[PDB]
Amino acid sequence: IVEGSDAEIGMSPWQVMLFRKSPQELLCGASLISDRWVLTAAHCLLYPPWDKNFTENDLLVRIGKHSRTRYERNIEKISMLEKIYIHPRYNWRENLDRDIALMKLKKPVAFSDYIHPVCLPDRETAASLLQAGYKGRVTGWGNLKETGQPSVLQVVNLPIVERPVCKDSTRIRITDNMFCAGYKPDEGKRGDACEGDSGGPFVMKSPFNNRWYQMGIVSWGEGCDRDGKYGFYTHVFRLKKWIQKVIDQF
Amino acid sequence: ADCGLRPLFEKKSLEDKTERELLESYID
Amino acid sequence: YEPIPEEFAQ
Ligand SMILES: N=C(N)c1csc(CNC(=O)[C@@H]2CCCN2C(=O)[C@@H](CC2CCCCC2)NCC(=O)O)n1
Questions:
Q1: CATH number, domain at B3?
Q2: How far is the CA of A161 from the centre of ligand 1 (A)?
Q3: A217 Cβ partners below 8 Å, 6+ apart?
Q4: Catalytic site residue A67?
Q5: Could you give the 3-state DSSP secondary structure of residue A238?
Q6: Among the partner residues A11, A206, A210, nearest to B16 by beta-carbon distance
Q7: Which of A87, A198, A219, A225 is catalytic?
Q8: Domain range enclosing B14
């Protein structure tokens, strides 16, 4: 996160850290949607252009964390993956279309003050909140500036942007399975996700029932926090059917 | 069931530093 | 990063 700030304790109890066994390093952000399922971006797991093709035994899931590098004893929990599911029509070749993947934990994790799941949007919620000008929240342990790393979890609030503006800001073919967010050049304020934030959740709080909902997944961007450029997130609701499809039968 | 409700905030009716920023942008 | 307990590395 660039131009953000330190999250407060228990602010994002669903935030997940995708950690690599060897070498031990941060791999990506993710989110807890139930006691046995983790949602993240597909490119965190598969991405041929960089020879990236991880398996269930290559990673570990770290939940309930605040600090980026410390093993927060008695607070965080580590889980092993039992299976991974990449969306079958994930287009890593062109524009990272349908950048999404589900991860099945070997065993359920017990919730606590620091470990709680976020809600998945339904049509009504998505329809009512997914509007330009409405702000969302992105969290991550990624880089603080375009390339170093933050000591603690970073948070930033960003406004959703009109499709047209998003489209005219890049040469990348935009699809309906993605949306973009960030401040415009004149708006004065700034901020963005960056390397290392991948797979992180973009969430919004409902004014109707006060629950937090995850509307997106940090997918891609061109540089970090450059004027005239915006971050792109996977449109979670649009892939809601595949999500239920999987979980349901597995 | 009780997804989206944080133990240290919503469940004890406390508000975080900036959630006010989000709600003030939802101008329907 | 601070080392993780081997018990999970299995
Ligand atoms: N400014 C952001 N929000 C932002 C910037 S990089 C990121 C995480 N995703 C990524 O890094 C993904 C993974 C692979 C290619 N990604 C990128 O973001 C690449 C651009 C993609 C566009 C779609 C086709 C493949 C390349 N840009 C990097 C840069 O501009 O520095 N979020």
A1: 4.10.140.10
A2: 18
A3: A31, A39, A40, A41, A99, A100, A199, A200, A201, A202, A233, A234, A236
A4: no
A5: helix
A6: A11
A7: A198
A8: 1-28
